[PDB]
Structures are given as structure tokens and as C-alpha cells.
């Protein structure tokens, strides 16, 4: 197999140390390093990676990633320019993916996916325990979503959709390589699209369950999620008038209790959360509120002076992601600002009157929420 | 709707108050009460059903299950009577069977059974929490069973594949009754039957969660459960050469937490299990053993003497299990006793090595434990 | 024993239930209901008492408060009233004190209490379990005070000083009935003198668990806790100077694992309270801050523009808490609505940084506080 | 501060990580080992003291008990050898013992009975989570003594009164050193010693809380806690008589939730237990159960030839326990033989009936125990 970690700025010693890991494993036959640009990680791993081969008899190299994709050169051009290298320059009948940032991964990861993809799997995903205010694009818009939109498909029942970390064998990379839609996907979109193909063209998948979970890059506010929030916003957007007839084999490994360590953290910081949410006001996002009910106008107007969120229930949240749908012109400032104040005051909503109970009842929370948005959009 | 309850021998109050809580219900059509014998139950039903159909519009009524099948005269003479009376004297579009000594039932499952069906399944099966001593027939039989022989298929996955409270659309029924297989299971076996072949022809299958569990009838030792034992085995056994076939097709609601008081109860007495392991031993039985591996055969003459359990681990219970699907006879009385202890030195080796160090910890052992068991059939 | 109930507005069936419970309790001989004022609650009360007496063959009466402190006619005067009563007007040993809007009483809590006082103690307090946002007043007030104040002491100890569940016997009741301290807390101030002075007097004490918790009345944003927090830190207040001997008998029953439904809800309205937080401001507070450590100053500025709350962690807490004990006056309002802001920031700041966290973690930081602020205090 | 590990047959390395902890740590100024015999361990410390004396500056020495007591030499000889070295050779103001078989000692440890001290108590007392199935003669024999014999005392509120982890004051050392009762517990009574004495002699007690838990040398059957037990009970025998007249001042840090780790595991091997209950069989012993209950005489005697122990429930031990304090010959090997299987009973009992339930079940159940069994006492 060939085990691909995609990096844009990381500590070379996070990223150091799993590619030692990978390179060490029996059924590793190549690693190789994604890069975003040149930078101190990037002449780190090239410095360390010919000792590393020759301790381990395994191959490990380094590139940038090539333009391949349409929208803002990121995550999706490091991945595809990935694809294409195991497809076109190696004879490797497996690709993994793993984010580089991983302070938690071990040989345990890739032996699991291994062992499913023998089982006879196409897509082997990864997924983890979290934190109940963790994984709230996950939620809240990825999730959302599909279940908004493909209630009858398995697309909204996929744990971590966003998830970095994933096992495909060739010709399921070959697949979404080759699909114009998914090659596009340059930005943060990637793992939607990858996500979103391979339920569509019935690649079998079996999520895996790692369960001392995966510590990586921390957030402080909700807006250095911003960028990620409209990007993965945007594909969803981009596939909306997509149909999924049918269908794709699909089974979970069974979730074991969550780390005490994992579910006693919280993931973002509430006092920056509110002030943001009263910062970047424009004369026209006042006015591009007209288009949503009146709840949610007046509650997003509300935060111009003061914090307001508890308008933005589940209920609201499902309004405000038609408009959204519908009118969300992706690069439009406005629009962009707009979604994440939106986005903003859902989680800040369930942040409050959910995650606050607790994180078993976060978690019911969040299940019967995607079960109610799928019974909602099947009664149109 | 129809609502069916079978009964063989129970409280009238705690049946007539499920019958009363049905008939109330907006969607049920008709209440079909199926009983084993004219006794007590049945007349307190009889006299009961005019008054109530009168009080709640909806119609009630009680009859004596039909000899459909070939084994011993049981539920599934009673669930197939059922499915007679449902297919060729009513017009309903679904029927719903629950067990009759449930004594948590609330309009809630019904509801939530209709909605699932709304939404388009043919088959709905509820599913209950469980303390970590309950349910074991369920995993040490049935999904047993079915994990190894059936690894590639749905049919390990399916929660409670023994659970008599579910609802068929009526084409599943249609099926079910039309097929020779089913119909004969006069006996326990029955559900297990409707599990296996509802897989098999793809059948889309939702299995719903039911918070407040499902409180019936609790035992004393194993042994009041011997010939659901042999029964249910004996069903898995008749199945073993049955090939799927189709995919299809099973999404599951989201378990919550389990309640405090589920979880906190044992679900047998430990004395009086070592005792009867001691029990209704015979020279043939000793001799029997003599078809099972070394430390299976060593362990249950023990037996004899003093309670030995610690051999009958997870490897050990396979290995036996093969041995069992190939010499085991239906009806032989030392077979049948025979299942019986070594079931027995099982479900003991579980509880004191799995189940004694915690709710969490045994559930993750279940669900690995079919896991190994699935990887391994794959493997040959 | 004589059982009390103060009530100043209730559900007259709430509290009827109470009384019934207690006059049908084989121990007790009288029951007494205080009141307030001769309202709705007081006339229902003394309608249904001569039956209840009947009935049971237990007196039960109805009075009026006199007015004993000089303080807020409140409470105090109530419990103080029935303290009187208790000592001159009747022969019995004990006296029990329970809040009348509790909706989850039963004889369980009578007999525990005086199952303990059989064992010997002077006092039995009851205790319960807590959602991690309830009990904001008795943690970051009176707990912290007893903890800043005195903590080679048992005060800090206690699990539930200002709770209004209690049996004292004869010579604990005449010993807080005769001095002028207790006397004169007319006002919510009541129970943390009780709580205070049976400490100082070496009265011995037992905690004594009540499983199934309190449900009682509920509330909104802080602010309906104004009044009663303004009472309870002028209580702490007018003690600081005390010199609290040294450590008598002091033993609590062990608690059991909190219910699920009473650690899974939200114990007061967020929004409101960050709204609360930007209201009711007067120049002479901005003034008064002036007098507060450099982060809680502005800190506190902020809150007129926007809601702050980060700078009040532990540290902040007690220097602030220090500065209030020195400067703060009773009955002024800027001062009381300073208080009030304070407060809230102590309580925003823990409900997003810890109670977020998880009810065990919030309980583990709680505990940890008292210990932190103790040490602290220890070292000067 | 002198820090003693009494050592009688370990492995060097762990010991030896001890010594090198507890000699780094800033505030030893000596370490002693204490052994029984001149073995393998024995040889490893003196060779390594001088090494560890060095290069942490602190002086480590090894030396061979002396015999002091006049029971079986045992535990006790080494610690009263470590009190006597303390007290006569050296000028420190406190010692701490800790078992050399601990695998998760960490400075920690030391800290924090330290700064306890240094708030002024007599002896600090380590206490530790524990698996439900642990600490089965603490429970069952030694805290259930306290609370039969000495209800209104703190024994029995002590959490771990056979703990060796401890901090002494020199006066304290030297009053139990003086104290000829404990002097002559050379046995495993001594830690049973210490608590009583302590405690009657009005020694303020702080309980302090090592959340990492305390992982030390595992139990197969049973019996090889055998001559602990008959030792730790006559212990509590030896003492019946003695009066207890003062207030210790008792304090104990609050726990945290039991690690998972330490939750998750069973303490003991059933089926092995279950054999032995029917070993060693005399017929002193059928005869000495004559002196015993009916239910507990016939119980017993099943076990001849099966297991049988739901007839020792927590009534049946209380009643047992009294026929053993009055009749219970220390050194008589019926009697020894006896206690172990009445024991062995209650210790299945607790497993089956409660330990099955759930960790927390079995903690209310546990503490509840002694709360009635401190009432019964009471009552007499
Ligand atoms: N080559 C390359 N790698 C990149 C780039 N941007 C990010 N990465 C790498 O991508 C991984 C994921 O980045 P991070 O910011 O650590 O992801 P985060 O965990 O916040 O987000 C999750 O959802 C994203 C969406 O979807 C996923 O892309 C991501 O892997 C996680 O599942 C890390 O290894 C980064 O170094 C890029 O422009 N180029
Ligand atoms: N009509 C009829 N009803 C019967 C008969 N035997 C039992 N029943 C009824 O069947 C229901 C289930 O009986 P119970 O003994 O309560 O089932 P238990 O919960 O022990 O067993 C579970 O697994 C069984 C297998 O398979 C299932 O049959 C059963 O429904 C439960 O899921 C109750 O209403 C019984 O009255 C029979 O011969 N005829
Ligand atoms: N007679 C009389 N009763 C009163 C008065 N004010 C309140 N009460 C009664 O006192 C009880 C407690 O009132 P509530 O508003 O329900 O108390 P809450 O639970 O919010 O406060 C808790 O901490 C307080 C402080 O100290 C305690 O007074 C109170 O008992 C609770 O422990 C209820 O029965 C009230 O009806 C009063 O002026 N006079
Ligand atoms: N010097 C000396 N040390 C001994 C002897 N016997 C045992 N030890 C040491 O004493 C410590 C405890 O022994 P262990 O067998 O691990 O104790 P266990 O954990 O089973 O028992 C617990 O309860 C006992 C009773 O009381 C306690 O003595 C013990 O410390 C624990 O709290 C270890 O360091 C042993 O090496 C002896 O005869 N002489
Ligand atoms: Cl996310
Ligand atoms: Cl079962
Ligand atoms: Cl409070
Ligand atoms: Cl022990
Ligand atoms: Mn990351
Ligand atoms: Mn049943
Ligand atoms: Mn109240
Ligand atoms: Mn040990």
C-alpha cells in the first residue's frame, strides 16, 4: 500500500513521527508526503526521508501538489495531485490518507484499514470519538445536508464525512480521479466530494473505529473555521440537484465509550464566538436577511448589538439551509460573512441548550436531529 | 394497521393493557389476539375485546393459533396464524406483531414503527437496551450463528434477530407465509426464521430504538430457557447450507444510553446455573464428548464433579459450535442436554470474565466478538 | 417530632401533599406551616388542616410569621417564627425543617433524618444531587466564603449550607433561637447562619443523601436569584470576623451517582443572562470598579458594550471576592447590582469553561476550587 | 522525611523504581527499605542503594526486620522495625510507608500526603479507586468489624484501614511504636493496628485521594488471600473488648470518578474460588457449624458437594460474623479452614448478587452495608 499524509504548516516532528510509523508498517510499500509549498516541514521531511527509507526498506518522498482543481488552491489539489501519483507512477493496489497534524496515530490504524479492505471493502473510513462541541461543520452543515437532501441514501449515516483518514483500493481511486466533479474540488471541499462519489457509485464502505481518537490541531473562535465552513458549505451547494439511485453496501464498527480525556474538553472559545458574531457588519448582509424567515432575520439582526442565538433551533437551522441553498452565491463577501454568523448562532444554539446537558444527551441530540431532518425532507 | 399479540400463558391484566393502548392508537386498524390454548387468558380477553372495540372504535379479537407447521406446536404456529388471518381476511397494508408480557409498551412503538414504514421499509424491527446477563441465546446462538455463516451478509448485524416486536408491510408477509421454511418453524425458532429470510430475499430492513427498554418475563437458572435453546439452534442448524444472495439493505436508529435500571440487574441465577450444570448427566452424553475438541471435552466432564466454565472462551465456543452444527440431532435427548450444559459453561465463562467487569466493557466484547467471529469465517 | 414547611407563595396542592405525607409519617406528632401572608397557599392550608389532623391523627396548624429579625422580612423571620413555636408552645424533641415547593418528598426523608438522630447527631442535614449549573449561589458564595474565611475549619465542608432541609434537636434549636446573630437574619440569610453558627457551637453534624434529589421550583435568567444572592454574601459579610474553633463531629453519607434526568438540564437561560449582564448600569458602578483588580475592572467595562466573562476564572473570583468583603455595602443598589454582574461573570465564566466539560469534571473543579481557595487562605 | 518500603519477595525493578522516585523527591531526606528476608531483592537494593544514595543526594539503606511482636512474623515486624529504626537513629519529623509492590508511584504521591501534613494532621492516609471485586477483606471483614463493634466511631469511615500507604508524625510514630497491642501485631495485622489505635487515641486523620490508583500484585483464587484473612480477623477479635472515646478529626478529600481502567477488571477467578469451597473438608469443621445459624449451618454444608453461597447475604455475614468474634480460635486450622469458606461465600454472594450489577451499584451497595450495619449496632 501507499500511505499519503497531506501537509500544508505542521511541525515536522508530528509529521516526522507518523511517517516513521506508516514507513515501519509490513504493508506499507511507499509513503509519500503531500505539500501545499516549500516551506520548514516541507525541507524537514526531504532532509529525513532518504535515512528513513534505508532504515525502514520502505520508499518515502515529498512533493508540492500540482493545480489540478478549479477553486482555491488547497486540501483538494494536495489529495488529487496524491491520486494521480499512485494511479499514474506506482503499481500499488491501495491508497491511504492520513491528516499530518495526528498526534495519536499508530500502527493499529493502518492494520485495521488493511484488514477491512481484505474483508472485500472498497472505502475503508476512519472515524473517532469527539467532543459533543467538536465536528461542528460534521454536523451541522455536511451531515445536515445529506440528510436534507438524500434522506433515502446512506450519505447522511456516513460518521465523519470530512474525515481525513481513509483507505481506497485502486480502482476506487481511480474512479474519483477521474470524476470531474470531485477533480475540481481543489479547497476544503475534497473530502465531501470523495464522500459524496463514492456512495453515489455504491463503493462499498466500512467505517473503522479508532478509539484513543485523534489529537490534532486545536480551534479558539469559530472563525478560524471560516474558510472551511464556506468551502464545504459550497460543495454541498454544488451537488444539490445530484439523484442517488441506489445503492451502497454499508457497515460500522461498533463505537466504544468515549475517552473520559476526549469528551471532557470543550472546542471552542464562547467569549470570542460572541463578539465575532457582532463584528463585520455590512449594509449588505442586513439586507440579504430579507430572503430568510422572520425568526431568523430578526434574530441575526439582534447580534448587532448583542448576542442572539436561541432563535436558531433545529427547526430554523433546517429553514435557513434552503435559503442557503438556494441563494448563496459562494465568493460573494457578504454571502460568506453571512453563513458563518448564521452557522455561528446554530452552534451557539446547541451549544446552550444541548451540549450544556451533557454528552450522552448532546449525542442523542445530534442522531435524532439527522433522523428528523430525514423523515422532513422524505415528506416532500 | 393490524396489531397482533401472541400468548401462551400470561397476566389478563398486563395483555388486556397493551391491547387497550393499541386499539387507542390512530393508526391501528384491528387488534388480533393469538393464543396457545383456551385457558384463563384467553378468556379474559374474550370477555374484554367487545367492550373495548365499542370504546375505541377500533375492532378486537381473539383466536386459537392453527397447526401450520411440522415441529413442535409453538409460537410460530401462533405468528403464522397471524400471518394467515392478516394475508386472507383483512385488507391492511401492515401488521405489527409484540410480545403479550411486555409491560413498557406506550403508543411510542407504534408510532415510531409506522413512521419507519412511512419512510418506506418493508420491514421495521424494534430493538431494546439490555443488561449485560440478558439476551443470551440472542448472542451466543443467533448472531453467533450467523456471523459464522454468514459473514459477507447483514444478518450478524441485525441487533435482536430473536426480538417478536416488529412490523411487515404486506408483501414481506405475503412472502414469509408463502415460504415453506418459515412455515414450518411451528416452534421458537420462528423468529429466527423471519430474520434469516427477510435478509435474504433483500428485504430493506430499520430497526428502532426503544429508550425505555421492553420489561417482561425474567428468569430464574438457564434452564427455564433449554428448549428455546435447542429450538433456536436447531433453526440456525436447518439454515446452515442456505446461500445470499442479494444485498439488501439495513440502517439502525441510534442506540441512547442505557437506563440506570437496565443496565443494574442480572439476568440469571449464578447458584443454581453451576448446580444444574452438575445435572441429568448420562454415559451417552460423556461419550458425545468425545467429538469435541481436547479442552471442550476435558471441561465439561468436569462437570460431573464440580462447575468448570474457564475453557469456554470465545475460540473455544466456534470450535464448538462447528462441532454442534454437524452432530447435533434435533430431538435426541442428550444432544439436547448436551447444548444445553455446554451453552451453559458459556454464558457462565461470559459473565464471570466478560460481563463482571462492567456494562461497557461487555458490550464492547459482544460486538467484537462477532467481529473476530466474521473475520474469521471469511478467513476460509 | 415536629415537622415544618415555610412557604411564602406555592401551589397549594404542592404543599398540601407535603403536609399529608409528614401528618401520615408514624413519627412525627406535629406539623406546622409558616407562612408568609394570609394568601391563596394560607387558606387552602387551613381549610384542609382540620380534616388532615382527622385523618391522620397528627395536628396540623397554620401561622403567620412574626417579625423577629431586622432585616428583609423573609425566611428567616419564617424558620425563626417556627423555632419559637417549637420551644415554647410544644414538648417535642425534634424539629424537621423542609422547603415547601418540593415536588419529590416522601417519608424516606423523614425517616432518614431521624434514623440519624437516633444514632446520636445534633443535627441532620439533607443533601442532594445537582445539575453542574445549579447551586451557583451556594458554591461561589457561601461554600467560597466559608473556604476563604475559615479553612481549618468544617465550614467549607458542609455539602449544602444554605439548604432548607433539616432536623435539629430541642437543645441545637434553643442554642440558634437564643442568639441574636440568628435572631436578627430575618432575610434569605437564614440558612447560612444556622449553617454557620451549629459549626461554631461544635453542634455534631450528619449529611444524610436523598437519591431521587429535589424538584422544586425553577428559574429563569439569574437575576430571580438577585435578592436572595445580595442576602447571602451580606450574611458571609457581617461574619467575617468570627473565630470558628475547631473541627467537631462532621459525617456525610456517601452519594450515589447523580440521576440521569436530573444531570442532564440546563439550570438557567444563557442568552438572558448575557443580555442581563449589559443592563441596569449607572455611572457610580463604572466608578465603584475602580476599587477591583485591573483584568475584572475591565472585565466588568466591557460588559456595557458587549458580554465579557473569561477574566473571571478561581483566581479573579477570590481576589474579587476579597474586595467585596471589605467595601461592599448592603442595601446600596449600585453596590447590590455590581454584586449581581460579578456573580454572573463567575457564573458564565465556569458554565463555558468547566460545566461545559462535563457534569464529573465540574464537580472535580468544584471541589478542587474550595481546596485551591483553602490552601490559599491557609497561607496567609 | 524517612520513606519505608517493607519488602518480603518482589521484583527488584519495581522496587527499585520506588526507591529512585521517592530519593529525588525534594523533601526525603532518607529511604529505607525494610525486608524479610536476606533473597534476591534484597541483594539487588544493596547493591543499588549506594548508586541511588548518590546521585540523588539522599542516603538509601536496606536492613532485615527484627522481631518485635510475638504472632507470625510477618508485615508487621518490618514496619515495626522501620518505626523503631525512625524513632531511635534518625531526627526526621515524619515517615511515609508505601508498599514496594506498587507500579504506579509517582512523586505525587509523597507531595501530597506532605503538604496534608503540613496543614497540620497526625497521619495522612493514601486512598485509591477500586475494581468492585477488590479490597474483599477490607469490605467484608475489616470495615464490617468497625461498623458492628465501633458504630459511632470514625473505623469505620476510614476508606482503606488496611492500606500501607501512610505519613506518620514523629509523635505519633512514637505513640504507636510505645503501644504494646501493636507492637506485638507481627503478622498482617499491623496495618489493622495502626487504623484502630490512631483513631481511638484521637490522631486527626486526613484521607488523601491518588487518582491514578494503586497497581500492585493481582489474586488467582481466592485463597491466597487465606492467611491475610484469619490474620486481619483476629486482629478485629483481639480488639472486641476495647473502648473508643474520642473524636479523631476525619477528613477526607473528595474522589474522582473510578479510572476506566481500574473499573474494567475482575479481582478474582470464580471458577477456581468455586472449586475450593469444596476442598479441605474435616469434620471439626461440619461440627464447629452447629454454632452457627440455620441458614448459614446448612449453607455451608452444601459445599460439600456444590457451591452454594446466595443464602450469605448481608444478615446471614452480620450474624456469622458475631458467632466468629465469640468462637473463632486464632492458630486452630478448623477454624482457619471455616472462616475461609464462610468468607468465600460472602464474597461470591457480593459478586453475584451485586457485583454483577454495575461498578457504581456495587459502591451504593458497599457503603450502604455499613450504614446498616452501624444502625444495628446502634441498636444494641
Ligand atoms: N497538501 C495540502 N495539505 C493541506 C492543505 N490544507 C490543509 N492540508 C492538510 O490537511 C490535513 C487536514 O488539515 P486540518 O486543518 O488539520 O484539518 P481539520 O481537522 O481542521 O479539518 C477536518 O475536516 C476537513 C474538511 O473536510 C478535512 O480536510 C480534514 O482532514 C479534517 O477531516 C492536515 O494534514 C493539513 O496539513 C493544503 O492546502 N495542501
Ligand atoms: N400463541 C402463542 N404464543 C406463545 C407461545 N409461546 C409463547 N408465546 C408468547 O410469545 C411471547 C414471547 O414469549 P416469552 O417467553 O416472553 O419470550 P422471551 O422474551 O423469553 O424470548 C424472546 O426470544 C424468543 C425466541 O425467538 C421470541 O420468541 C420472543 O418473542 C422474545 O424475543 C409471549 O407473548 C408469549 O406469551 C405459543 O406456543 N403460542
Ligand atoms: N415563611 C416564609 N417562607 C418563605 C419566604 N421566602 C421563601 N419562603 C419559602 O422558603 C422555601 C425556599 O424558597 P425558594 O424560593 O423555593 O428557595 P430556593 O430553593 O430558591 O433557595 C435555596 O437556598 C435558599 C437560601 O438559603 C434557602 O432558603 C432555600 O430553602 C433553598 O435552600 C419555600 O418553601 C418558600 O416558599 C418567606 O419570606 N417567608
Ligand atoms: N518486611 C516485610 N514486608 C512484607 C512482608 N510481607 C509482605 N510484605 C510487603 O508488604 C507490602 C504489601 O504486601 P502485599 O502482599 O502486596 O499486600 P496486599 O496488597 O495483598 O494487601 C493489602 O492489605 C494488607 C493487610 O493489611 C496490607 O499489609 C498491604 O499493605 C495492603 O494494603 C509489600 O511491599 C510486600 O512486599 C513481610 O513479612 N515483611
Ligand atoms: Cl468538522
Ligand atoms: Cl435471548
Ligand atoms: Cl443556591
Ligand atoms: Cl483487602
Ligand atoms: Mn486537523
Ligand atoms: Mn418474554
Ligand atoms: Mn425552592
Ligand atoms: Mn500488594
Redesign the interface.
Known amino acids: 500500500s501507499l500511505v499519503v499524509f497531506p501537509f500544508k504548516h505542521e511541525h515536522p516532528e508530528v509529521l516526522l513521527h507518523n511517517v516513521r510509523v506508516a514507513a515501519a508498517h509490513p504493508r506499507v510499500h511507499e509513503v509519500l508526503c503531500i505539500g501545499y509549498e516549500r516551506d520548514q516541514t516541507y525541507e524537514a521531511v526531504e532532509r529525513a526521508a532518504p535515512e528513513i527509507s534505508r532504515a525502514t526498506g520502505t520508499p518515502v518522498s515529498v512533493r508540492l501538489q500540482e493545480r489540478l482543481g478549479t477553486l482555491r488552491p488547497g486540501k483538494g489539489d494536495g489529495m488529487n495531485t496524491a491520486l494521480r501519483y499512485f494511479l499514474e507512477e506506482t503499481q500499488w493496489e491501495r491508497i491511504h490518507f492520513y491528516d499530518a497534524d495526528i498526534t495519536s496515530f499508530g500502527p493499529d490504524w493502518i492494520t485495521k484499514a488493511e484488514?477491512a479492505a481484505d474483508?472485500?471493502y472498497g472505502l475503508v473510513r476512519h472515524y473517532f470519538p469527539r467532543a459533543?462541541?467538536d465536528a461542528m461543520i460534521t454536523w451541522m452543515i455536511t451531515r445536515t445536508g445529506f440528510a436534507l437532501l438524500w434522506?433515502?441514501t446512506e450519505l447522511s449515516?456516513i460518521e465523519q464525512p470530512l474525515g481525513g483518514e481513509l483507505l481506497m483500493r485502486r480502482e476506487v481511486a481511480a474512479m474519483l480521479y477521474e470524476d470531474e466533479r470531485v477533480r475540481r474540488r481543489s479547497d476544503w471541499g475534497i473530502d465531501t466530494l470523495y464522500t459524496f462519489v463514492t456512495v453515489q457509485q455504491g463503493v462499498s464502505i466500512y467505517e473503522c473505529y479508532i478509539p484513543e481518537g485523534k489529537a490534532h490541531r486545536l480551534y479558539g473562535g469559530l472563525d478560524d473555521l471560516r474558510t472551511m465552513l464556506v468551502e464545504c458549505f459550497a460543495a454541498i451547494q454544488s451537488l444539490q440537484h445530484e439523484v442517488v439511485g441506489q445503492?451502497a453496501?454499508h457497515?460500522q464498527?461498533?463505537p466504544?465509550?468515549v475517552?473520559?480525556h476526549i469528551?471532557?474538553?470543550?472546542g471552542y472559545?464562547?467569549?470570542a464566538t460572541?463578539?465575532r458574531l457582532?463584528q463585520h457588519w455590512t449594509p449588505r448582509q442586513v439586507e440579504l436577511l430579507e430572503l430568510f424567515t422572520t425568526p431568523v432575520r430578526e434574530g441575526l439582526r439582534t447580534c448587532q448589538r448583542?448576542?442572539?442565538?436561541?432563535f436558531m433551533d433545529e427547526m430554523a437551522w433546517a429553514a435557513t439551509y434552503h435559503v442557503l441553498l438556494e441563494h448563496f452565491q459562494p465568493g460573494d463577501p457578504d454571502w460568506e460573512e453571512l453563513l458563518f454568523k448564521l452557522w455561528t448562532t446554530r452552534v451557539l444554539n446547541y451549544?446552550?441548550?444541548v451540549?450544556?446537558?451533557?454528552?450522552?444527551?448532546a449525542?442523542?441530540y445530534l442522531?435524532?436531529m439527522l433522523?428528523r431532518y430525514?423523515?422532513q425532507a422524505?415528506l416532500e
Open positions: 484488514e474483508f472485500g459533543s462541541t434522506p433515502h449515516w445503492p453496501i457497515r464498527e461498533h466504544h465509550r475517552p473520559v469528551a471532557e474538553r470543550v472559545d464562547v467569549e460572541l463578539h457582532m448583542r448576542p442572539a442565538f436561541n451549544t446552550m441548550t451540549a450544556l446537558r451533557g454528552y450522552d444527551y449525542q442523542q442522531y435524532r433522523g430525514r423523515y422524505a
